[PDB]
Design a protein around this ligand. Sequence first.
Ligand SMILES: NC(=O)C1=CN([C@@H]2O[C@H](COP(=O)(O)OP(=O)(O)OC[C@H]3O[C@@H](n4cnc5c(N)ncnc54)[C@H](OP(=O)(O)O)[C@@H]3O)[C@@H](O)[C@H]2O)C=CC1
Ligand SMILES: COc1cc(Cc2c[nH+]c(N)nc2N)cc(OC)c1OC
Length: 162
Amino acid sequence: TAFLWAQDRDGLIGKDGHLPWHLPDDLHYFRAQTVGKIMVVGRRTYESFPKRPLPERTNVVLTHQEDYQAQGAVVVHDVAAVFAYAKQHPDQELVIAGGAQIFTAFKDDVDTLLVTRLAGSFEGDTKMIPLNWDDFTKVSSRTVEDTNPALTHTYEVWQKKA
Ligand SMILES: NC(=O)C1=CN([C@@H]2O[C@H](COP(=O)(O)OP(=O)(O)OC[C@H]3O[C@@H](n4cnc5c(N)ncnc54)[C@H](OP(=O)(O)O)[C@@H]3O)[C@@H](O)[C@H]2O)C=CC1
Ligand SMILES: COc1cc(Cc2c[nH+]c(N)nc2N)cc(OC)c1OC
């Protein structure tokens, strides 16, 4: 169970469906970070995504309906079931992809946190949930500059201590 999202300096994520900042280098970070892993996206994000499902990537949708028809992409309606699959897959763990609703239900059960902090500052109404950074420790961090002052950003990966 890991969290994988992107936020600006204030900690924004996405406003009204489409993200607030257009960062091409971030999308690659999202795909590369979920290659061969289970991608949990709530019915709101999966419905807002641009190209679904991802190529050679495990994607799971979360919804409260019972007739959700999605051939090619996994489908579940209870975090309890999703937690089972990852425990049963020896090569596909549980990775969260959002949106905010999915970061809250899994906030208690977290194992790895992946956040992208951009240098630019955007505004909106939906932001990432309150994570306990004090209980986790960043094990890997990479900063990359870009021709655009705001499109600049860093990748932070954390792990839960025991
Ligand atoms: N920074 C980032 O990484 C990401 C950011 N974003 C931004 O966030 C927005 C989405 O945030 P938010 O408004 O919170 O919505 P979400 O996209 O997080 O909504 C998740 C949906 O999943 C379903 N769901 C949630 N919990 C459960 C559960 N326990 N059982 C069953 N179904 C469940 C609900 O759908 P239902 O209506 O079917 O019950 C819920 O509306 C995106 O539009 C985008 O702007 C989106 C993805 C990633
Ligand atoms: C991989 O493509 C998208 C991915 C996301 C979610 C997302 C983005 N970036 C990061 N770092 N984590 C995420 N979960 C949101 C999108 O739009 C809101 C996308 O389409 C541009």
